[PDB]
Swiss-Prot record:
Activity regulation (UniProt): Inhibited by isoniazid metabolites. The prodrug isoniazid is metabolized to isoniazid-NADP adducts that inhibit the enzyme at subnanomolar concentration.
Organism the protein comes from: Mycobacterium tuberculosis (strain ATCC 25618 / H37Rv)
CDD domains: DHFR
Record keywords: NADP, One-carbon metabolism, Oxidoreductase
Originating gene: folA
Gene Ontology CC annotation, any one: cytosol
Catalytic activity field: (6S)-5,6,7,8-tetrahydrofolate + NADP(+) = 7,8-dihydrofolate + NADPH + H(+)
Family to which this protein belongs: Belongs to the dihydrofolate reductase family.
Pathway note: Cofactor biosynthesis; tetrahydrofolate biosynthesis; 5,6,7,8-tetrahydrofolate from 7,8-dihydrofolate: step 1/1
Designated name of the protein: Dihydrofolate reductase
Protein origin, superkingdom: Bacteria
Length: 166
């Protein structure tokens, strides 16, 4: 359970087996099971994203509904209609439960404060290319639960990981 006076920080992302999470300002696959899972985890909570992740969402769908949207930017004139723009993680992480929803820069930034990661791994062969956004690497202070491989309606294998630390 999450006490209302704490500040729990989780990370949630979907990656190829190579660790790629983003390419060319988008996610280089689509997996309905993953979007359903992302909604199930994050709904009702604050979500924190980097400015480039906000940019990657079509204007008509953002801010993502059912969640307090917070965007990280260092640009004093960047504005996110419907959402709050802050310049640091300290400003972004004031809710009792916060999910950092990407992208590569902000995962790495937020990991020192996080105690949970929820990962979808997609069994698509997407090798790392220069410029890609990548999943954060987790050191030995993390302990993980790896699900068995499942099969999506769209014909891709995928599996879920849950990582925790104190
Ligand atoms: N597969 C997934 O789970 C997943 C999830 C989310 C996103 N993505 C993909 O990942 C890519 C985006 O990731 P990215 O690494 O390029 O960018 P990002 O992490 O989404 O955003 C980077 C931006 O965040 C701001 N920022 C970074 N560090 C900051 C700090 N310390 N304080 C304040 N603001 C800070 C800066 O905005 P300013 O430049 O405005 O200062 C920076 O340009 C896209 O391809 C997207 O589609 C994938
Ligand atoms: C669903 C992708 C995802 N999956 C996991 N597991 N964790 C994340 N943090 C994550 O990204 C959430 C922010 C990027 O959302 C998208 N980006 C590109 C296309 C579609 C979407 C879905 C919102 C628009 O309907
Ligand atoms: Cl969503």
């Amino acid at each position: 359970l999450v006490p209302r006076g704490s500040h729990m920080v989780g990370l949630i992302w979907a990656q190829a087996t190579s660790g790629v999470i983003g390419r060319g300002g988008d996610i280089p696959w689509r997996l309905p099971e993953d979007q359903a899972h992302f909604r199930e985890i994050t709904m009702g909570h604050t979500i924190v994203m980097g400015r480039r992740t906000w940019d990657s969402l079509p204007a008509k769908v953002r801010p993502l509904p059912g969640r307090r949207n917070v965007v990280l930017s260092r640009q004093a004139d960047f504005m996110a209609s419907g959402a709050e723009v802050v310049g640091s993680l300290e400003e972004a992480l004031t809710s009792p439960e916060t999910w950092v929803i990407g992208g590569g820069q902000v995962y790495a930034l937020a990991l020192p404060y996080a105690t949970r990661c929820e990962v979808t791994e997609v069994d698509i062969g997407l090798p790392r290319e220069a410029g890609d956004a990548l999943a954060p690497v987790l050191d030995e202070t993390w302990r993980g639960e790896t699900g068995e491989w499942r099969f999506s309606r769209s014909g891709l294998r995928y599996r879920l990981y849950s990582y925790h630390r104190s």
